Amino acid sequence: LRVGNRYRLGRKIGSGSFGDIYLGTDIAAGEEVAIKLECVPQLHIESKIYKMMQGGVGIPTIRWCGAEGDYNVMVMELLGPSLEDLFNFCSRKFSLKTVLLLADQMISRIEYIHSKNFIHRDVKPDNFLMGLGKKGNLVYIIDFGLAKKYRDARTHQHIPYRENTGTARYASINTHLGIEQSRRDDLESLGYVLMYFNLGSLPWQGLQKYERISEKKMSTPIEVLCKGYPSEFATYLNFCRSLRFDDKPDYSYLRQLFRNLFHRQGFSYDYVFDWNMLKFGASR
């Protein structure tokens, strides 16, 4: 069984936003790949977005795009485990060093996507994957199925402020209020992801239910949310919430917050994340 006469098809391994994902092998390489399938529609648009993103650091490479049988098909390099997977392996606790190391790269990925005229609109641990081999310390961003253009390609004219979607847990407050998303919202979602990494859980977890999530988010002060953690996180979230709809975020400032924190703590920029330090042994 071959997709596009080159990629042998395998077991189902996941889902994206709206298609199924299967393991595969480029037998002509020989490389392991991920293959997204879609019943004959959104895959082709996402694939155009992926192609626009090619070349950037931490953007997965598209090996092949096309259609076969009853399916639209996209073939991508298969990467490593998501940040959520790794979070679970590390007992749902990341050290501060690991969080800051992740923050640096994640802010960079979001900035690149913005530099290419798009907003991701679904920033969450499952859409960040680690690389393989010599790129094992590289954070990749995936899934452009909900992505949307925020400014005109030629003029750079920002879209107009408007009314009216991804995962509720990490959604920006503007999103809960039915506001059209922009750059600030990707960055805010990132803030929630980082605090999630610090805490093990967010205070609006385990409470229609989107209304309860929205009101819990709105009723939770940032200084309560970030109690017991370096002030940099509260500063980050406040900055993101303070951005105007069409403002260009100061990505460098946000990265420098976390970097200066990183150095004042004495951590070294090697790439030892917590998951490079797990102990193994016999069945316990």
Side-chain angles (χ1 to χ4, degrees):
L1 182 49
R2 291 174 181 167
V3 61
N5 280 337
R6 185 176 171 175
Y7 313 103
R8 184 177 65 177
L9 195 59
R11 281 168 103 278
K12 174 185 282 181
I13 60 171
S15 295
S17 305
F18 23 64
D20 278 342
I21 300 171
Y22 296 80
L23 180 62
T25 306
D26 188 336
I27 60 99
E31 182 189 22
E32 293 300 309
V33 301
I35 305 169
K36 202 173 174 182
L37 285 176
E38 194 203 37
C39 282
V40 176
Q42 210 174 342
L43 194 57
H44 187 67
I45 284 159
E46 181 180 5
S47 62
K48 171 53 153 74
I49 301 177
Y50 266 108
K51 289 172 175 64
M52 277 184 269
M53 302 290 171
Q54 301 291 268
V57 182
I59 300 294
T61 298
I62 304 252
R63 294 307 186 195
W64 187 73
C65 185
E68 190 164 336
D70 301 341
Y71 290 97
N72 288 312
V73 40
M74 183 168 60
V75 173
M76 220 99 86
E77 61 175 325
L78 184 70
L79 302 163
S82 82
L83 292 187
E84 175 67 20
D85 294 331
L86 290 169
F87 194 54
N88 281 324
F89 278 76
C90 292
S91 313
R92 303 188 62 79
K93 188 178 190 161
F94 280 159
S95 65
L96 181 59
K97 177 185 168 181
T98 281
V99 179
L100 298 175
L101 277 174
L102 287 174
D104 192 63
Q105 294 194 53
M106 288 164 98
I107 298 170
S108 300
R109 302 302 163 263
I110 291 170
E111 176 178 21
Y112 177 78
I113 296 172
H114 296 170
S115 84
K116 299 288 181 176
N117 314 323
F118 284 86
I119 52 177
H120 185 280
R121 307 206 291 150
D122 202 14
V123 170
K124 62 178 187 181
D126 268 305
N127 286 341
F128 289 94
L129 268 43
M130 296 310 291
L132 297 175
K134 67 177 87 71
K135 296 197 182 295
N137 51 4
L138 186 63
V139 179
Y140 286 76
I141 184 158
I142 64 162
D143 203 323
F144 288 92
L146 293 173
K148 176 176 179 177
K149 203 175 295 88
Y150 75 87
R151 67 180 180 190
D152 179 85
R154 64 164 287 263
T155 56
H156 282 183
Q157 184 181 325
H158 203 287
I159 55 177
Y161 187 92
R162 206 59 113 230
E163 194 181 53
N164 292 280
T165 201
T167 300
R169 185 189 296 178
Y170 307 108
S172 73
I173 303 174
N174 289 324
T175 298
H176 283 294
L177 304 178
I179 304 306
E180 182 91 276
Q181 291 177 51
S182 58
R183 292 174 284 196
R184 62 191 184 161
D185 301 285
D186 280 343
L187 296 174
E188 177 170 339
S189 288
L190 182 52
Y192 298 143
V193 169
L194 296 175
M195 279 313 298
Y196 171 74
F197 285 154
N198 287 322
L199 288 168
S201 57
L202 292 169
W204 41 85
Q205 271 177 260
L207 299 179
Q208 312 190 106
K209 80 173 184 192
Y210 284 1
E211 186 276 326
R212 292 187 64 189
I213 291 169
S214 323
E215 285 307 318
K216 185 69 185 191
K217 279 196 186 141
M218 279 181 283
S219 76
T220 308
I222 291 167
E223 57 270 24
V224 171
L225 175 66
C226 304
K227 188 197 179 180
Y229 291 92
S231 64
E232 280 72 7
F233 292 98
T235 303
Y236 176 95
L237 280 165
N238 271 318
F239 187 90
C240 290
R241 291 190 182 170
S242 293
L243 284 164
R244 285 184 295 273
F245 177 70
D246 65 338
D247 272 347
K248 186 194 184 64
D250 196 339
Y251 303 96
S252 286
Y253 166 73
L254 294 179
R255 266 185 308 260
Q256 283 295 107
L257 266 174
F258 291 133
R259 279 168 181 164
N260 292 336
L261 175 61
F262 183 93
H263 294 300
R264 289 190 324 262
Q265 293 279 306
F267 302 146
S268 335
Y269 278 110
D270 50 8
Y271 293 92
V272 178
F273 298 98
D274 293 337
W275 55 84
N276 299 129
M277 290 182 301
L278 294 168
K279 278 169 193 169
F280 61 83
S283 282
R284 296 166 44 181

